[PDB]
């Protein structure tokens, strides 16, 4: 969707695999604020907003 009508998705109640995001060789920018990008796999969260 366009940036004025940006799409928000609620992620909850599932096991999340962040290894497939990190190993991919297409993502030019992977800038993580407040969390280490390598340690995304370690932590647990309650709700994710995409």
């Amino acid at each position: 969707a366009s940036v004025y009508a940006w799409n928000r998705k609620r992620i909850s109640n599932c096991v999340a695999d962040y290894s497939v995001l990190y190993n991919s060789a297409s993502f030019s920018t992977f800038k993580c604020y407040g969390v280490s990008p390598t340690k995304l796999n370690d932590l647990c969260f309650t709700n994710v907003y995409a």
């Binding site: 060789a25 297409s26 993502f27 030019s28």
Partner: protein, 49 residues
């Protein structure tokens, strides 16, 4: 004839032009009859790193 070149090397795929691709890689004749069809393939031919 299919190949992959960078963006500033597309203008050398033409009759009568010069450059590294024209001299050493792919040379078209001056009496060439046919078409050159070039499209961007950044998703398929680039990886980060």
């Amino acid at each position: 004839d299919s190949f992959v070149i960078r963006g500033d090397e597309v203008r050398q795929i033409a009759p009568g032009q010069t450059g590294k691709i024209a001299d050493y890689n792919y040379k078209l004749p001056d009496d060439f009859t046919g078409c050159v069809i070039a499209w961007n393939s950044n998703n398929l031919d680039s990886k980060v790193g």
